[PDB]
Paper text:
AMPA glutamate receptors (AMPARs), the primary mediators of excitatory neurotransmission in the brain, are either GluA2 subunit-containing and thus Ca2+-impermeable, or GluA2-lacking and Ca2+-permeable. These cation channels assemble in various combinations from four core subunits, GluA1–4, with each contributing unique gating kinetics, trafficking and subsynaptic localization.
A GluA2 mutant (F231A) increasing NTD dynamics phenocopies this behaviour, and exhibits reduced synaptic responses, reflecting the anchoring function of the AMPAR NTD at the synapse. The role of B/D NTD interface stability in this transformation is supported by a desensitized (R/G-edited) GluA2(F231A) structure. The NTD dimers of the mutant receptor also transit into parallel O-shape conformations, and the LBDs depart from two-fold symmetry, which again is coupled to an increase of non-domain-swapped receptors (relative to the resting-state receptor). Rotations are larger for one of the two LBD dimers (C/B versus A/D), and movement of the B/D subunits is less pronounced than in GluA1, perhaps due to subunit-selective contacts between the NTD and LBD tiers. Transition into non-swapped LBD dimers probably involves relaxation of the critical M3 gating linkers of the B/D subunits, as observed in an NTD-deleted NMDAR structure, thereby entering non-conducting (‘deeply desensitized’) conformations. Closer analysis of the three sets of desensitized structures reveals a gradual transition of the LBD tier into four-fold symmetry, which is greatest for GluA1 and smallest for the edited GluA2 mutant: GluA1 > GluA2(F231A)-Arg743 > GluA2(F231A)-Gly743.
Residue numbers in the entry:
A (entry chain A): 520 to 551, 569 to 629, 633 to 715
B (entry chain B): 765 to 773, 785 to 823
C (entry chain F): 5 to 43, 55 to 84, 93 to 162, 173 to 210
D (entry chain B): 569 to 626, 636 to 666
E (entry chain D): 569 to 617
């Protein structure tokens, strides 16, 4: 749900927040459990995982550091959950002849001498007539000489070619 | 032929959350400044 | 031991300074698919200042990045200038100077604290720089070894800072003995 | 009652961010205040997350604003039609 | 260490339900265990919701 750079910068920020909490909490000599480096790393990790604390900063500087880390955690965790939900929600949702006729970038062809070419040629429906105009004009000749030729041409055109054929052959191919 | 036949036309990224990083680092800086100010003040008071 | 802490602090400071300087200098920040030089597309180093061609008609040619083609304009400005990485290097340098002056002109005991503040601040500057860079690039790819040198610089600098602060704390404990 | 103004502000901020407490009101009235702030935080944060999940899942200005500039062909039925018109727009 | 077996089971259950702790490991090893359990809980509960 979150990009790679976001995770990387979350880790860098965790190290920084911990070091600064240690510095502000213990550098002054006029302040001599409390936040040593180890305890400060623990406070920050626990805050990001929203898993509560055993201690919390008591001084103004410590509380500023804590506050910004808390806000950062809220936005990042909420965003993780929201984007995960969007992934799963969307997942729960060109695929027809008209969509093929509309797309002229993709090339489609048929067997040269076959019921498919004759059916398109003698057709009277608008979609099939547009397809017939395209094939009759689409240079180079989209027509092939054999079904296996169209199979290979599709399997060897980076998906820039489509083949129109009887369903039985497709059913055999998808099953093999 | 001359109009319809010629038709020719997720993972949040730092960019989406950069602001929260900016706020975090800004806060870290403010905190360091406050601490240093307190130290300098209490240091002068330690003179007397 | 107390004597080794100064050695660890000093060697760490030197390492952080060197790593950050090399990263600001070298060009291996982003292995992108770009244009080697204009007047089609190949893998490119694209460091912080100059993007340089590789695997190309003329591999090796390097050019200056065209940062520019209002918040977007200000980001472009902060990215074209590398104020943040450069500031990180400056701060690390001053931190090193403080560590060095820890011995000569000793017994001040605040010069060590200054070293620590400088190292930690260099770290924060390094992270802001990285975020600006990554945000500026977008709007496949990969991050080179200079980008990770920068990151290692941040980690070492934070550690050297923690050691510095620890040393300052110990010096005042001894003074209060 | 260790709730001074600074500690009160810390308690409230920490409750909004759904984070650690470290001190909880013990009196009846302090607990009323805390309860309503808790409920407010639950509804507002739940709705922030829910609406982010929506966001992350789903002019006539011409005359209705002169900043945009509009023009026509110099010699054409369009210029003449506008010139011969009498309608307000 | 107030972490006998009964207290350990309570700490874990509570962490999973995203509720309070009332005690947190203080040693290095205990802290490692706690951290991984916290991460596991975050991912699993976020996914349930």
């Amino acid at each position: 749900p979150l990009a790679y750079e976001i995770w990387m910068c979350i880790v860098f920020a965790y190290i920084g927040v911990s070091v600064v909490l240690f510095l502000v909490s213990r550098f002054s000599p006029y302040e001599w459990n409390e936040f040593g480096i180890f305890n400060s790393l623990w406070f920050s990790l626990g805050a990001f995982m929203r898993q509560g604390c055993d201690i919390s900063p008591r001084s103004l500087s410590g509380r500023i550091v804590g506050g910004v880390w808390w806000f950062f955690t809220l936005i990042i965790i909420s965003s993780y959950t929201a984007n995960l939900a969007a992934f799963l929600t969307v997942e729960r949702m060109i695929e027809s002849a008209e969509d093929l006729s509309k797309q002229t970038e993709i090339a489609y062809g048929t067997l040269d001498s076959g019921s498919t070419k004759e059916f398109f040629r003698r057709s009277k429906i608008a979609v099939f007539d547009k397809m017939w105009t395209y094939m009759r004009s689409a240079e180079p000749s989209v027509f092939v000489r054999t079904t296996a030729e169209g199979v290979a041409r599709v399997r060897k055109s980076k998906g820039k070619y489509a083949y129109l054929l009887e369903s039985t052959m497709n059913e055999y191919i998808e099953q093999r | 032929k001359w109009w319809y036949d010629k038709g020719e036309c997720s993972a949040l990224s730092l960019s989406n959350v950069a602001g929260v990083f900016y706020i975090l680092v800004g806060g870290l800086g403010l905190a360091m400044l406050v601490a240093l100010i307190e130290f300098c003040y209490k240091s002068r008071a330690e003179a007397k | 031991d107390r004597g080794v802490q100064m050695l660890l602090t000093t060697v760490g400071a030197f390492a952080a300074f060197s790593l950050m300087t090399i990263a600001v200098g070298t060009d291996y920040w982003l292995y992108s698919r770009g244009v080697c030089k204009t007047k089609e597309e190949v893998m490119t180093h694209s460091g912080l200042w100059r993007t340089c061609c590789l695997e190309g008609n003329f591999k090796g040619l390097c050019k200056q990045i065209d940062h520019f083609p209002t918040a977007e304009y200000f980001l472009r400005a902060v990215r074209a200038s590398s104020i943040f990485p450069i500031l990180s290097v400056i701060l690390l340098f001053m931190g090193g100077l403080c560590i060095a002056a820890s011995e000569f002109y000793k017994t001040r005991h605040n010069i060590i604290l200054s070293a620590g503040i400088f190292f930690v601040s260099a770290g924060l500057s390094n992270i802001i720089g990285i975020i600006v860079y990554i945000s500026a690039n977008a709007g496949s790819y990969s991050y080179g070894w200079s980008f990770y040198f920068g990151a290692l610089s941040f980690i070492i600098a934070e550690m050297v800072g923690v050691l510095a602060v620890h040393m300052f704390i110990d010096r005042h404990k001894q003074l209060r003995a």
